[PDB]
Amino acid sequence: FSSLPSYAAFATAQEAYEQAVANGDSEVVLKKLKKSLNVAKSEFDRDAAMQRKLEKMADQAMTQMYKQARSEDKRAKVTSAMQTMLFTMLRKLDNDALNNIINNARDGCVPLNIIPLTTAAKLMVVIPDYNTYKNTCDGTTFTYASALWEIQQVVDADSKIVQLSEISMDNSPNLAWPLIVTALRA
Amino acid sequence: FSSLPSYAAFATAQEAYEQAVANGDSEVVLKKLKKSLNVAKSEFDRDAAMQRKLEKMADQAMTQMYKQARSEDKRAKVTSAMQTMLFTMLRKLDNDALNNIINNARDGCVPLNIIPLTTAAKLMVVIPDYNTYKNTCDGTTFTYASALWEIQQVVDADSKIVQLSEISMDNSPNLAWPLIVTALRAN
Amino acid sequence: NVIPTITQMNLKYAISAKNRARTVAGVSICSTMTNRQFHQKLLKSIAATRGATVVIGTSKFYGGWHNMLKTVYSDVENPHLMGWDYPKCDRAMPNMLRIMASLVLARKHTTCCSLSHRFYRLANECAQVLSEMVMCGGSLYVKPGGTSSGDATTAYANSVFNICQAVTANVNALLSTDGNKIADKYVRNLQHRLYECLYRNRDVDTDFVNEFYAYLRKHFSMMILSDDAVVCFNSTYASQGLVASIKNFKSVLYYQNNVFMSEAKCWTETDLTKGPHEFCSQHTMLVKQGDDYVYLPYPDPSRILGAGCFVDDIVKTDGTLMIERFVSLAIDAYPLTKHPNQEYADVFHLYLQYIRKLHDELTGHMLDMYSVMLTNDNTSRYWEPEFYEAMYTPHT
Amino acid sequence: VGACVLCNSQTSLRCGACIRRPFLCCKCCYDHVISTSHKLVLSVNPYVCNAPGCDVTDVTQLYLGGMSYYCKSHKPPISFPLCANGQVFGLYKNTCVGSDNVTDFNAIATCDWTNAGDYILANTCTERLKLFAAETLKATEETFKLSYGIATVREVLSDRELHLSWEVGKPRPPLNRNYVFTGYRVTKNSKVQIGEYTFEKGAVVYRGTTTYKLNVGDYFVLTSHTVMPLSAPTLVPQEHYVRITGLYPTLNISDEFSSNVANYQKVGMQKYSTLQGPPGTGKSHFAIGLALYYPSARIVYTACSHAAVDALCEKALKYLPIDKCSRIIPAVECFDKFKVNSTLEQYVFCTVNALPETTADIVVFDEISMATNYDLSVVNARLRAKHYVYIGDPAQLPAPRTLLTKGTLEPEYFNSVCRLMKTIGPDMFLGTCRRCPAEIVDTVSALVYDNKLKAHKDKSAQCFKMFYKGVITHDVSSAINRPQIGVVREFLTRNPAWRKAVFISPYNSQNAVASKILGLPTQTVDSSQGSEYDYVIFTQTTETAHSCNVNRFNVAITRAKVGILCIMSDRDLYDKLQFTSLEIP
RNA sequence: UUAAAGGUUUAUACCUUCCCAGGUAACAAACCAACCAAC
Ligand SMILES: [Zn+2]
Ligand SMILES: [Zn+2]
Ligand SMILES: [Zn+2]
Ligand SMILES: [Zn+2]
């Protein structure tokens, strides 16, 4: 608290007192130099008091104001923050089965139900084209989630059953493309 | 604190004090001058400490009776809400079938658990699986509590309508299975 | 009169070690008010009294837990520690013992009310807390019995229940003894007079109940909090069948609570210098501080780590906005420092460092985002262990 | 928490008296509050006195006490004013630039959008201020729509004719095509929409999109919608290139699109391009030849109204493969032979208000005349494109401005693209008119096209003009000139073939009386844009600025393929008309 | 170095008591708000 007029007044009072002490003038004369000095801080220790309270008061209000802003906007972007955090954790996990499925989902292949873990239950996987069929389906076997699934059914989009060997490179542009492959776990 | 009657006391005291200080007559005459303002700065102290502590208690009294009025208004609001809720819920009583039963009591007192058992005009059953469904609500009508009930509406956990033909043994695993079935008292 | 009420059933949302959907009871306001006006003065005396068997209302901080343990060890001749846990305390308590608990709480009204007033208060209690109607999922069901956690007097009623089960176990044990092989003439006379007072006396005997209470207080010392209990007992009397062992207690629960207790819910301890194995999910370590040995509570570090890793609200995922959460966690996990294993103290050091990290992050964000500083000097104490050493040190 | 609309400094203070509540930095918000009546500033919590039962909301009269805000009477002993040191206290106080002059922002935030100067300032202020003014104007229009009373069906006189009772205490909106109502049907505890309607003086004649047997109880309200805030500029900064970027021109093109090929190359040579196509010049032909010139290009055709997008789709059916085009329809009958709600195809046709967030190789915005800066900002926000082609005509009709009462809006103030086209000139110009006879083309070219529009056809000698004031009568919201209708009657009796013509007038009541007496189909000039007819009969019906507008008159007289007869009241444009003058019988 | 004591008011200085407004520190009590732990 240096940039206040009372600081200048206190400095003048202290200079006068220092001169009186170094001079040793009288006993009432220097008393007048402290009858008007300790009061000069009585209006200096106070006008530097409520403003000193105010600086930290503005601080300890504006800080919770920031905290309110962060609280109110943090809960407004949860739907994206959680999913980004999920995918970062997924990619950090580094598991072959999950990576295979996430790549299949990103390009062409998503299932139609929960993938079962028993060696008896059924799975339906959509294949959008023949390129993904090349990578995934090789004959009667279907590789998916680091597992083998025997093919027993594949149907085009308009619900017409199509046999296995019918599909190849050049006769492929003759079927409804979002194919649904039914398979059973090995 | 400037419109107080003593602000004139400071005005005159300080004016005379500074006038005679600039005049600089003598200390013998300035003693009374420096004592008049000395007691004047006390007059303010008295009649100002008598006031500036009063607006605090006045303000807090204002706030108190304000919130007391607010609470009293909320009291009337909840009174109205409670009374209208009671009078709206009473209108459903179906005030005939209950009268026959209550007139049959030796003193008018009947156990509450039988009031919906004998007077309620609607029944809803919650069924966990088809097996128990067969034993209780098979067919288009069934019996319970010495009464005959007729089915109208069937829904699943997802609150979507389910047809009576859809509930078979083989089709059951395709349905949410806290099934809700509502029936009406047949007459 | 009697005023039936409805208590709502609520699905709790909190962390737990087993996939069980624990619920709670939102009891209505009439019961809350007209039970508050009665057990408020009944219970504020209990909650503020130190050195009694009931320990509720006393903090473990500032050496409290050590004082509790010293009180439990009050002049036990052959001391051993024993603890149990009822399988389903709240949903299997038979109706009679609930009535008994309400009655022994209402006993303190010999002056302020007439007998009919007491009876009607008890009637209202059993009408809105014992066999009332509960609304679960928009429908009304009748509660066959048990107790409704959510009233004003659940913990103290369970304390009364625990005391009753312990004492009846002791009596059943002592009257199951042969009585000819027993060596102490005083104890044999005690047995004979106890039988006479039970099955041959239609009135109460103050003298014998005082003597028997003195007997148990001398040889069978309990410390009780809700349904959890810690008892110090004489080995010789237990071996000779003079006081209740784990077997008698199990038998008593079997024939008077319709439930069988297993060994996973009960523990024994032959070394009293280790403290009890578990109490309120708090383990005990005997350690050294200030030229004195005291017992300090330490929790499961898994619980603390789970609290750190997972939270309740989405806003709770940011440590910066809420540092005091980590502060209180640090007080609670501080006694892990003295544990011989390194990882338990390592959890506490982790928390101290991460509190410091979040304070630094908060300062950085605020200064970059608002070019003013308020980091102060008191905050530095939050990552210093003395703040946590004084919390468990007995001067407050 | 946001950015200053005048400084872009991060600040979480929004003016509470402003309808759009723009974020304002400490210095800027201080200047705005001290210079205008706007004394409310909002933050994450509102800067309002926390006293129970107090009404003080002037930030200049508020103090931060405890952790709340209080007036002088209710403040605790320790506080400081929020409005001091030439700034309003708030978050992000140190990071603040301030503005030397806030006059434009003050004028925009305080104007009532009834003067032409307001729109001129809005189209000439800063881009951030352009967005702010567009938001303010659109919100003001939406609010003003709410001030009108509800019209309720009191009696069903017949089909397509009704009897409406109006709410007391509220004004009645004009009954023309520019005010589209929506019907609500009476139910137990709520209301259900029954679709959109338009109304005209009968009793009242109602034109509904879907026909019903509506009864007493149904009412009609002008539906309003939320005005979303704008972030994207009306125009992305211009980038000029030395080679065609992002586009591969086809090596084989037909003569039908050959005349545009060079212009198509310019499309690939600059970031955004502006096209001026006069009536009958082939604007949609240009837009579709751009696609055929770059067969692999990803193109978003967009427009404000459904009709322009439907016209683009109709052209696409003619030249573009149907499998590669899809029409986006929000959940009004529109184009329904392209696949609906498909985004990842090659060619997507959609309105501005329903444009999805996507990227494209070319974005073609047709009929720039009706566009507003709000539409430009929305298009720039939703569509990320390598090239933008703005097709339209500043010499044609703009979007109607209902609130404007004082002054006339010039073509250079219609929007940013129109401003560029009227200041620096269009990037491309279609100088050959294939629709109108040579007389009409010469007249419009001398009028608004700076003698740059050329006529493909020869003079048809069927373009006639007559100077006849007649008698002007006024209804609640339109004007009628019956003597002009009588003159048209005499002309039709003496020229029966002209009974194949279509009557066009700037007033809807004039159209109603003309349809009742003549029997010819009737069109307002505003609704006639985008259409074409063989023979046109136009009556000015007044000499007001609405009827004498150069763009409106150009649009009205460019509707004729062969012949047009103009019964004109204004001497100026009548002399400007290069038609064969006829004498009054 | 200069009779003594007593006498009055005033001025000065010292000390003491009380009152009064200013500030600092401490203590406690209440209210309010957030958060944690236990059953
Ligand atoms: Zn009592
Ligand atoms: Zn600014
Ligand atoms: Zn404003
Ligand atoms: Zn106020």
PDB file of N, CA and C in Angstrom, chain D residues 229-291:
ATOM      1  N   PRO D 229     -27.484 -18.239 -32.508  1.00  0.00           N
ATOM      2  CA  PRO D 229     -26.406 -17.256 -32.654  1.00  0.00           C
ATOM      3  C   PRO D 229     -25.485 -17.597 -33.814  1.00  0.00           C
ATOM      4  N   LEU D 230     -24.888 -16.558 -34.387  1.00  0.00           N
ATOM      5  CA  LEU D 230     -24.058 -16.690 -35.573  1.00  0.00           C
ATOM      6  C   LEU D 230     -22.584 -16.564 -35.214  1.00  0.00           C
ATOM      7  N   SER D 231     -21.774 -17.443 -35.802  1.00  0.00           N
ATOM      8  CA  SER D 231     -20.335 -17.428 -35.575  1.00  0.00           C
ATOM      9  C   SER D 231     -19.580 -17.269 -36.888  1.00  0.00           C
ATOM     10  N   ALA D 232     -20.028 -17.970 -37.928  1.00  0.00           N
ATOM     11  CA  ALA D 232     -19.349 -17.931 -39.212  1.00  0.00           C
ATOM     12  C   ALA D 232     -19.598 -16.602 -39.921  1.00  0.00           C
ATOM     13  N   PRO D 233     -18.595 -16.080 -40.621  1.00  0.00           N
ATOM     14  CA  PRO D 233     -18.781 -14.827 -41.357  1.00  0.00           C
ATOM     15  C   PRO D 233     -19.722 -15.006 -42.538  1.00  0.00           C
ATOM     16  N   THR D 234     -20.305 -13.884 -42.965  1.00  0.00           N
ATOM     17  CA  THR D 234     -21.150 -13.903 -44.153  1.00  0.00           C
ATOM     18  C   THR D 234     -20.356 -14.283 -45.395  1.00  0.00           C
ATOM     19  N   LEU D 235     -19.073 -13.929 -45.440  1.00  0.00           N
ATOM     20  CA  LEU D 235     -18.192 -14.321 -46.529  1.00  0.00           C
ATOM     21  C   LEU D 235     -16.834 -14.724 -45.976  1.00  0.00           C
ATOM     22  N   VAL D 236     -16.386 -15.917 -46.355  1.00  0.00           N
ATOM     23  CA  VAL D 236     -15.040 -16.389 -46.047  1.00  0.00           C
ATOM     24  C   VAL D 236     -14.069 -15.503 -46.818  1.00  0.00           C
ATOM     25  N   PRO D 237     -12.912 -15.150 -46.254  1.00  0.00           N
ATOM     26  CA  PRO D 237     -11.976 -14.275 -46.973  1.00  0.00           C
ATOM     27  C   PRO D 237     -11.584 -14.852 -48.327  1.00  0.00           C
ATOM     28  N   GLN D 238     -11.465 -13.966 -49.312  1.00  0.00           N
ATOM     29  CA  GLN D 238     -11.270 -14.386 -50.692  1.00  0.00           C
ATOM     30  C   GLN D 238      -9.861 -14.921 -50.914  1.00  0.00           C
ATOM     31  N   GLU D 239      -9.770 -16.011 -51.674  1.00  0.00           N
ATOM     32  CA  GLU D 239      -8.492 -16.569 -52.096  1.00  0.00           C
ATOM     33  C   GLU D 239      -8.528 -16.786 -53.600  1.00  0.00           C
ATOM     34  N   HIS D 240      -7.608 -16.147 -54.316  1.00  0.00           N
ATOM     35  CA  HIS D 240      -7.478 -16.308 -55.756  1.00  0.00           C
ATOM     36  C   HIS D 240      -6.298 -17.218 -56.065  1.00  0.00           C
ATOM     37  N   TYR D 241      -6.468 -18.062 -57.076  1.00  0.00           N
ATOM     38  CA  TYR D 241      -5.522 -19.121 -57.387  1.00  0.00           C
ATOM     39  C   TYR D 241      -4.970 -18.931 -58.793  1.00  0.00           C
ATOM     40  N   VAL D 242      -3.843 -19.589 -59.060  1.00  0.00           N
ATOM     41  CA  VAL D 242      -3.255 -19.587 -60.394  1.00  0.00           C
ATOM     42  C   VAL D 242      -3.675 -20.808 -61.210  1.00  0.00           C
ATOM     43  N   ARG D 243      -4.027 -21.915 -60.559  1.00  0.00           N
ATOM     44  CA  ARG D 243      -4.521 -23.103 -61.238  1.00  0.00           C
ATOM     45  C   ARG D 243      -5.815 -23.550 -60.571  1.00  0.00           C
ATOM     46  N   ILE D 244      -6.597 -24.341 -61.309  1.00  0.00           N
ATOM     47  CA  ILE D 244      -7.828 -24.884 -60.753  1.00  0.00           C
ATOM     48  C   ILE D 244      -7.481 -25.873 -59.652  1.00  0.00           C
ATOM     49  N   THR D 245      -7.917 -25.572 -58.430  1.00  0.00           N
ATOM     50  CA  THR D 245      -7.580 -26.368 -57.255  1.00  0.00           C
ATOM     51  C   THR D 245      -8.800 -27.168 -56.821  1.00  0.00           C
ATOM     52  N   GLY D 246      -8.574 -28.422 -56.438  1.00  0.00           N
ATOM     53  CA  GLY D 246      -9.629 -29.281 -55.948  1.00  0.00           C
ATOM     54  C   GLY D 246     -10.627 -29.742 -56.985  1.00  0.00           C
ATOM     55  N   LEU D 247     -10.442 -29.382 -58.252  1.00  0.00           N
ATOM     56  CA  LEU D 247     -11.380 -29.722 -59.309  1.00  0.00           C
ATOM     57  C   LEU D 247     -10.632 -30.305 -60.498  1.00  0.00           C
ATOM     58  N   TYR D 248     -11.267 -31.273 -61.153  1.00  0.00           N
ATOM     59  CA  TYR D 248     -10.729 -31.893 -62.363  1.00  0.00           C
ATOM     60  C   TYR D 248     -11.742 -31.710 -63.483  1.00  0.00           C
ATOM     61  N   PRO D 249     -11.546 -30.726 -64.359  1.00  0.00           N
ATOM     62  CA  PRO D 249     -12.514 -30.497 -65.436  1.00  0.00           C
ATOM     63  C   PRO D 249     -12.608 -31.689 -66.374  1.00  0.00           C
ATOM     64  N   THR D 250     -13.825 -31.946 -66.844  1.00  0.00           N
ATOM     65  CA  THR D 250     -14.043 -33.038 -67.778  1.00  0.00           C
ATOM     66  C   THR D 250     -13.433 -32.706 -69.136  1.00  0.00           C
ATOM     67  N   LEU D 251     -12.970 -33.745 -69.827  1.00  0.00           N
ATOM     68  CA  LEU D 251     -12.348 -33.581 -71.132  1.00  0.00           C
ATOM     69  C   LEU D 251     -13.354 -33.581 -72.275  1.00  0.00           C
ATOM     70  N   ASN D 252     -14.624 -33.861 -71.996  1.00  0.00           N
ATOM     71  CA  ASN D 252     -15.679 -33.874 -73.004  1.00  0.00           C
ATOM     72  C   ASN D 252     -16.883 -33.123 -72.450  1.00  0.00           C
ATOM     73  N   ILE D 253     -17.251 -32.027 -73.110  1.00  0.00           N
ATOM     74  CA  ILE D 253     -18.405 -31.230 -72.720  1.00  0.00           C
ATOM     75  C   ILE D 253     -19.261 -30.988 -73.959  1.00  0.00           C
ATOM     76  N   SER D 254     -20.553 -30.786 -73.725  1.00  0.00           N
ATOM     77  CA  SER D 254     -21.513 -30.544 -74.790  1.00  0.00           C
ATOM     78  C   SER D 254     -21.618 -29.053 -75.091  1.00  0.00           C
ATOM     79  N   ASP D 255     -22.142 -28.749 -76.279  1.00  0.00           N
ATOM     80  CA  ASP D 255     -22.391 -27.371 -76.685  1.00  0.00           C
ATOM     81  C   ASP D 255     -23.424 -26.681 -75.804  1.00  0.00           C
ATOM     82  N   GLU D 256     -24.300 -27.444 -75.146  1.00  0.00           N
ATOM     83  CA  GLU D 256     -25.325 -26.848 -74.295  1.00  0.00           C
ATOM     84  C   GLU D 256     -24.715 -26.092 -73.121  1.00  0.00           C
ATOM     85  N   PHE D 257     -23.573 -26.552 -72.612  1.00  0.00           N
ATOM     86  CA  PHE D 257     -22.878 -25.879 -71.525  1.00  0.00           C
ATOM     87  C   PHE D 257     -21.547 -25.279 -71.952  1.00  0.00           C
ATOM     88  N   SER D 258     -21.242 -25.263 -73.253  1.00  0.00           N
ATOM     89  CA  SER D 258     -19.945 -24.775 -73.711  1.00  0.00           C
ATOM     90  C   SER D 258     -19.750 -23.296 -73.403  1.00  0.00           C
ATOM     91  N   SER D 259     -20.791 -22.482 -73.595  1.00  0.00           N
ATOM     92  CA  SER D 259     -20.668 -21.040 -73.400  1.00  0.00           C
ATOM     93  C   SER D 259     -20.295 -20.676 -71.970  1.00  0.00           C
ATOM     94  N   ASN D 260     -20.506 -21.584 -71.022  1.00  0.00           N
ATOM     95  CA  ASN D 260     -20.186 -21.352 -69.623  1.00  0.00           C
ATOM     96  C   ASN D 260     -18.828 -21.913 -69.223  1.00  0.00           C
ATOM     97  N   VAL D 261     -18.190 -22.694 -70.103  1.00  0.00           N
ATOM     98  CA  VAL D 261     -17.017 -23.479 -69.717  1.00  0.00           C
ATOM     99  C   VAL D 261     -15.929 -22.584 -69.140  1.00  0.00           C
ATOM    100  N   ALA D 262     -15.596 -21.501 -69.848  1.00  0.00           N
ATOM    101  CA  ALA D 262     -14.568 -20.590 -69.354  1.00  0.00           C
ATOM    102  C   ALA D 262     -14.917 -20.074 -67.966  1.00  0.00           C
ATOM    103  N   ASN D 263     -16.166 -19.641 -67.774  1.00  0.00           N
ATOM    104  CA  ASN D 263     -16.587 -19.192 -66.452  1.00  0.00           C
ATOM    105  C   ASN D 263     -16.424 -20.304 -65.428  1.00  0.00           C
ATOM    106  N   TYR D 264     -16.757 -21.539 -65.817  1.00  0.00           N
ATOM    107  CA  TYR D 264     -16.560 -22.679 -64.930  1.00  0.00           C
ATOM    108  C   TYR D 264     -15.110 -22.767 -64.474  1.00  0.00           C
ATOM    109  N   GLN D 265     -14.167 -22.533 -65.391  1.00  0.00           N
ATOM    110  CA  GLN D 265     -12.760 -22.550 -65.010  1.00  0.00           C
ATOM    111  C   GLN D 265     -12.468 -21.479 -63.969  1.00  0.00           C
ATOM    112  N   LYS D 266     -13.042 -20.286 -64.143  1.00  0.00           N
ATOM    113  CA  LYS D 266     -12.868 -19.238 -63.143  1.00  0.00           C
ATOM    114  C   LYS D 266     -13.418 -19.685 -61.794  1.00  0.00           C
ATOM    115  N   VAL D 267     -14.455 -20.529 -61.811  1.00  0.00           N
ATOM    116  CA  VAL D 267     -14.996 -21.081 -60.573  1.00  0.00           C
ATOM    117  C   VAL D 267     -13.912 -21.822 -59.805  1.00  0.00           C
ATOM    118  N   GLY D 268     -13.073 -22.578 -60.513  1.00  0.00           N
ATOM    119  CA  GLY D 268     -11.982 -23.272 -59.861  1.00  0.00           C
ATOM    120  C   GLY D 268     -10.757 -22.429 -59.593  1.00  0.00           C
ATOM    121  N   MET D 269     -10.756 -21.173 -60.038  1.00  0.00           N
ATOM    122  CA  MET D 269      -9.578 -20.322 -59.953  1.00  0.00           C
ATOM    123  C   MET D 269      -9.640 -19.367 -58.764  1.00  0.00           C
ATOM    124  N   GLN D 270     -10.750 -19.351 -58.030  1.00  0.00           N
ATOM    125  CA  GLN D 270     -10.887 -18.465 -56.885  1.00  0.00           C
ATOM    126  C   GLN D 270     -11.720 -19.158 -55.818  1.00  0.00           C
ATOM    127  N   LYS D 271     -11.546 -18.705 -54.574  1.00  0.00           N
ATOM    128  CA  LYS D 271     -12.124 -19.416 -53.438  1.00  0.00           C
ATOM    129  C   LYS D 271     -13.647 -19.348 -53.470  1.00  0.00           C
ATOM    130  N   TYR D 272     -14.204 -18.153 -53.652  1.00  0.00           N
ATOM    131  CA  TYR D 272     -15.637 -17.992 -53.834  1.00  0.00           C
ATOM    132  C   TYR D 272     -15.893 -17.120 -55.052  1.00  0.00           C
ATOM    133  N   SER D 273     -16.991 -17.410 -55.743  1.00  0.00           N
ATOM    134  CA  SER D 273     -17.338 -16.705 -56.964  1.00  0.00           C
ATOM    135  C   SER D 273     -18.788 -16.252 -56.892  1.00  0.00           C
ATOM    136  N   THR D 274     -19.053 -15.090 -57.481  1.00  0.00           N
ATOM    137  CA  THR D 274     -20.381 -14.495 -57.505  1.00  0.00           C
ATOM    138  C   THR D 274     -20.847 -14.367 -58.949  1.00  0.00           C
ATOM    139  N   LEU D 275     -22.080 -14.793 -59.213  1.00  0.00           N
ATOM    140  CA  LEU D 275     -22.650 -14.795 -60.557  1.00  0.00           C
ATOM    141  C   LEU D 275     -23.893 -13.915 -60.579  1.00  0.00           C
ATOM    142  N   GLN D 276     -23.996 -13.063 -61.596  1.00  0.00           N
ATOM    143  CA  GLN D 276     -25.216 -12.308 -61.852  1.00  0.00           C
ATOM    144  C   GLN D 276     -25.906 -12.879 -63.086  1.00  0.00           C
ATOM    145  N   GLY D 277     -27.064 -13.498 -62.876  1.00  0.00           N
ATOM    146  CA  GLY D 277     -27.867 -13.996 -63.963  1.00  0.00           C
ATOM    147  C   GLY D 277     -29.202 -13.287 -64.045  1.00  0.00           C
ATOM    148  N   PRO D 278     -29.368 -12.455 -65.069  1.00  0.00           N
ATOM    149  CA  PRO D 278     -30.662 -11.812 -65.308  1.00  0.00           C
ATOM    150  C   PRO D 278     -31.730 -12.845 -65.620  1.00  0.00           C
ATOM    151  N   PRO D 279     -33.006 -12.456 -65.614  1.00  0.00           N
ATOM    152  CA  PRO D 279     -34.069 -13.425 -65.903  1.00  0.00           C
ATOM    153  C   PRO D 279     -33.898 -14.055 -67.278  1.00  0.00           C
ATOM    154  N   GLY D 280     -34.155 -15.359 -67.350  1.00  0.00           N
ATOM    155  CA  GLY D 280     -34.044 -16.079 -68.601  1.00  0.00           C
ATOM    156  C   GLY D 280     -32.639 -16.239 -69.130  1.00  0.00           C
ATOM    157  N   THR D 281     -31.633 -16.232 -68.256  1.00  0.00           N
ATOM    158  CA  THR D 281     -30.248 -16.381 -68.678  1.00  0.00           C
ATOM    159  C   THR D 281     -29.669 -17.759 -68.378  1.00  0.00           C
ATOM    160  N   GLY D 282     -30.387 -18.603 -67.643  1.00  0.00           N
ATOM    161  CA  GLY D 282     -29.917 -19.949 -67.377  1.00  0.00           C
ATOM    162  C   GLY D 282     -29.061 -20.061 -66.133  1.00  0.00           C
ATOM    163  N   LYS D 283     -29.571 -19.563 -65.004  1.00  0.00           N
ATOM    164  CA  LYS D 283     -28.826 -19.651 -63.753  1.00  0.00           C
ATOM    165  C   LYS D 283     -28.714 -21.095 -63.276  1.00  0.00           C
ATOM    166  N   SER D 284     -29.837 -21.816 -63.250  1.00  0.00           N
ATOM    167  CA  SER D 284     -29.792 -23.232 -62.904  1.00  0.00           C
ATOM    168  C   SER D 284     -29.008 -24.019 -63.945  1.00  0.00           C
ATOM    169  N   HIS D 285     -29.070 -23.586 -65.206  1.00  0.00           N
ATOM    170  CA  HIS D 285     -28.267 -24.208 -66.251  1.00  0.00           C
ATOM    171  C   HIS D 285     -26.781 -24.054 -65.949  1.00  0.00           C
ATOM    172  N   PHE D 286     -26.378 -22.865 -65.497  1.00  0.00           N
ATOM    173  CA  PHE D 286     -25.005 -22.651 -65.046  1.00  0.00           C
ATOM    174  C   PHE D 286     -24.659 -23.557 -63.873  1.00  0.00           C
ATOM    175  N   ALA D 287     -25.552 -23.624 -62.882  1.00  0.00           N
ATOM    176  CA  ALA D 287     -25.273 -24.403 -61.681  1.00  0.00           C
ATOM    177  C   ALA D 287     -25.109 -25.882 -62.002  1.00  0.00           C
ATOM    178  N   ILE D 288     -25.859 -26.384 -62.982  1.00  0.00           N
ATOM    179  CA  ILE D 288     -25.794 -27.806 -63.293  1.00  0.00           C
ATOM    180  C   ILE D 288     -24.667 -28.102 -64.279  1.00  0.00           C
ATOM    181  N   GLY D 289     -24.338 -27.148 -65.152  1.00  0.00           N
ATOM    182  CA  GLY D 289     -23.172 -27.315 -65.991  1.00  0.00           C
ATOM    183  C   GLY D 289     -21.879 -27.226 -65.222  1.00  0.00           C
ATOM    184  N   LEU D 290     -21.893 -26.559 -64.069  1.00  0.00           N
ATOM    185  CA  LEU D 290     -20.744 -26.624 -63.174  1.00  0.00           C
ATOM    186  C   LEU D 290     -20.528 -28.048 -62.677  1.00  0.00           C
ATOM    187  N   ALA D 291     -21.615 -28.741 -62.324  1.00  0.00           N
ATOM    188  CA  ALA D 291     -21.510 -30.134 -61.901  1.00  0.00           C
ATOM    189  C   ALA D 291     -21.067 -31.030 -63.048  1.00  0.00           C
TER     190      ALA D 291
END
